[model samples]
Target: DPLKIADQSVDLNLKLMKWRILPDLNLDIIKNTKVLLLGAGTLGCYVSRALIAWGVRKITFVDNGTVSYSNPVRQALYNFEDCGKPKAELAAASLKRIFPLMDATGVKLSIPMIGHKLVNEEAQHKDFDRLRALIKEHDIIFLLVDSRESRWLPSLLSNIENKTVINAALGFDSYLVMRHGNRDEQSSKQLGCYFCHDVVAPTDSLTDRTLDQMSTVTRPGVAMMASSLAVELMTSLLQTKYSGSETTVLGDIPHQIRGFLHNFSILKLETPAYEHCPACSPKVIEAFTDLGWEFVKKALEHPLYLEEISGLSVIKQEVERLGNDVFE
Candidate 1:
């Protein structure tokens, strides 16, 4: 049965809003919705508050840092007293206090800034496995981490386990949303993977590997831009017809996302995609396979491998290799 909006004593528009966006059956959807927010700093707090407002009753918020006096202006959940308290705990507490019935838990944890840093030499399975465990229960994964390298973990996990991952990123006035891994209402093949976009350091170019972007701080306008991305994600989630896929994209770089290529820009903002991004499509895998380690070596040594692969060398092959074989 739909939420008895009348009995809940909520404004009819509020109830109508949910009914309008979701199915008519009024299934207890919001109650069932669970989200994992990996950062509880500025981006995470704001996103969590928004989700709670949207009736997502269960949430897990994690962060290693605490609210410092300097952070008060940026974090929406903390007050003066919260200064020096762990950010995740403070934020989670504030969120619950605001809406007692909402389910929000906080954890004190250090999020690695790099992908490889996560699965360290010790083969410590607890940290990653704990997160991996959360993967099974959460409805969606929200990545608010500042580092792109750090962002890849949830991205890979969501992809592998078939969970929706919403990436909210900001630098200067730029904001972008990269959604992945929701498989409902459409074939998985139709949906674009996050890796469909090109991979490069934050400073990579739209065309060249040498070029760089100069953004370093997140400003108010930038924050709003980021917020806009978050809302777009929520709206997409609320859509009854949502299929965990893109409805329409303006398109990214052709054949390959040469560096950080811009797909489309609203005025100064730019969005880009990579053609045959490995995360987005597996065809790129075949290309890398064809290249092999020997071919990769030849590319670095002769530039012939570079020419053969159409000018794209998927990282220096050695750097790409970690614990497992790429072919495997």
Candidate 2:
């Protein structure tokens, strides 16, 4: 009976927000969304926790990392002893441990990176294939990877699959959180992706790091803060469906939220899809859809080669020739 009462209390608390402030807030839809988190480190832990707090039930984590001594400090779900276990598995277990009724799964899968080569092409190609299926089944996706390159293939497939994906990446001083467009119409003919702003393609950022760069070094508080905001952003977008008469119930769903902890200020921002974007553009999406595993193999061979297909190589050349100066 106490367990049942405790279960009832959690829903009751969330209902207070609905009954008082946001009468249009729909907990049922929030409870039903199948969430896929691509990274199982700091952001993943906090994001999953917050989703559970908000009644998000089905969560699947895809992180190919083990708990290290370094993780339990910044990562919310790990402990000192969990250091040797797989992160994806532990994070999922934490959800069920906290709330018995929760449905959570950990997928210990490596996401193929655009600028990184596969150790075994045949074996890794199956990783790519599996990643695609995971994206297809989930209603929403969260990309919380450490580097830009790892986010690339998921961004492409999520785009191609037309799944709503929210991305959050932390900087030493700032943080980025954005949903990469809604549905199938360009993730927004106007909204941009993780790769939209850069002309240079993503390369292997995880390798060749100094001791300082060994693990990510953002504020522990920042990971928790940004992760909550990432989930909040998705909830805000979902509210559009329950509202009475409008485009949004939580005001305008921002294309992006750029947060800087130094100033303790957050800026609501928006950027249109880059015509030459390597990730979400029709050119890249169609290439993947058309070439299947072959397109991905070409991309893994060399990011620069992939850039040529997206016509970003030309853009880079123009910038280089001009010395990146447009004062003329």
Candidate 3:
């Protein structure tokens, strides 16, 4: 009966399977999934629905926003009647009602202000100790936040926990999924750290904090993009969880976006790598060995300085000359 229930759940779960990803294996991992989702807007809503349909039992939502009359267009957690309510609390209520068997909670918290790499605000850095603790608690983290302030803090938390952090972001009709941290078999020394992919970042599709400093925008279609990416990430997670495969990745590089696989689908896609990425810089590895967190604090600071670093103007001109949106 339990196995039948699991099968039924998998059959109903359509997030990743629509893309024909690892189907059978994903269900196997969803039998007892625990995830923390950081937003409740367009992307967060669908991601939560997908996770629940995949049979995830415990989900924690963290946000400080309220449901408005304008939000129902995308936020699946609320109805026309439930407007003007706290998103975290209300979403948790709605999800728990959807699957009575699942444990869901909503915390009325905002990303603390602080000065950490990937952090857009200074408050987020204040809770480094608390974040370190939370990172260690969950099996996986689903980052669906729309702001740079909300995005990078979890990246740091995931690294500290040394666990999987599935990141989904939508931009200008395109979307991306990043699977951070190595699986049990992979190590910081061997497989690849999140930073390895960061070098290739500021990709054409992604809004560069350096230039486009405004908050990211999301349309109804963009919601589906990130939700789909989340499913692919979950499928990869499930496969790696059950089948123990090493390469658990998924993404579509958009065509208009520079670099590889841009033509297959106008959506365009590629597997990213950062050979010279500061996060995975060779020198940082050396510093990590001899110096410690202080050196890390210094070395990791470069990506933050990216916007105001001053040399990028020349590169921007060159990029414009090439007619390319961004440098790879």
Candidate 4:
């Protein structure tokens, strides 16, 4: 008796999504792909919903935080009763409730934050190993963390493992969604990571900010908009890779998308891989390959270590020289 309603709902959902699309769209590629979500916040909750609606059957939620009273409204996966539960676990349970066939998992572990000391304790090291393995297992990784620093290690790990990574970040009235390029040796031009656009290294963004600045003070609609865009971006990229449609139907997969809620405008932008990027540059990847977590710990403690190795400091000096020349 219970199976009837659930099966009917599933049928309707699939038909609703598949009705208008042509066979060339390769919608089937979405169903078998596995996804690992790095944050169980507003964006993570909605992104998972979109993925499920589009027939993605495997998902994993990773979040270290527990749901709070304030989270129920914004995080669609949680409700008033879920206030004290671990976000990762509850989110996974919630998704399972929606679709009994979904293979959803929850990992509750603290991610390595930028500027934090490399914790070599047994548990933390185990977590690091687990994180790396998860990245390898998943078809795509979504970075939806609140802080800039929280995004660094995942960005590095995803690119190093050559997995598709979709990143979504929010502002008070704006959002940016992007997909990191694959790291392939034979490919002439690799796409840039999320950190490639940054001139300076990522740091603790909340350390010196006021209360208002410390929290994500964004419009409720911003997270939903960003989340939907991220899922669509991932689906489009999957279509291109699987359908063998080499044409740039989605504008050659622009590296970044910026949307402004206030102005109702969307901009697609692309940036080349930064030679001095601390996250995805050849130097950083090599160091990580050679030295492993030790290099990561050092870089986290002293961001300049990465800056020096990546030639970012030298680039900074050159930029300063050009700026002074203009002023003079």
Candidate 4's residue-wise lDDT over 1-328, tens digit each? 7867876787666665556545355556788899999999999999999999888989999999999878878899999988888999899999988887789999998887787666665666677788999999999999998888998889988888889899999988999999887777887787777888877888766656678433556789999999998998887777654356444333345679999988899999887777788898899999999988778777777877888888889978887777545664
lDDT of prediction 3: 0.58
TM-score of each: 0.65, 0.92, 0.63, 0.91
**How does candidate 2 score on lDDT?**
0.84
Off by over 4 Å in 3: 1-28, 113-126, 181-217, 240-328
CA RMSD of all predictions: 10.3, 2.6, 8.0, 2.6
* CA lDDT, every model vs. true structure: 0.55, 0.84, 0.58, 0.84
Clashes of each: 4, 1, 19, 0
lDDT of 3 by residue, 97-130 (tens): 7766668888766654223344632343444444
For model 1, residues 1-328, the per-residue Cα lDDT tens digits are 2345333654344577556763342324544678888888778877876776666678888787777776667778889888887888777788877766667888876543322322352233345556667776788787887665456445545655677777777765456665654334454334444444554322112233332323224564555456545644554454444246433121121111111114434431223334434333343234435643333223223323232343234454545666566556
For model 4, the local distance difference test gives 0.84
State the lDDT of candidate 2 residue by residue for 1-328, as single tens digits.
Answer: 8768868999899899889998877888899999999998889999999999998889999999898877788888899989899889889898888987788999999888776667898889899999999999999999998887788888888887889989998978788899886434434445788888878778787666657444577676678778999998888788754345434656667788988888899998888888788887667777888888888888876887768888988866877797646875
Prediction 4 TM-score vs. true: 0.91
The Cα error of candidate 4 at residue 279, in Å, is: 0.7
In model 4, the Cα lDDT at residue 290 comes to 95
Error of 2 at 319 (Å): 4.6
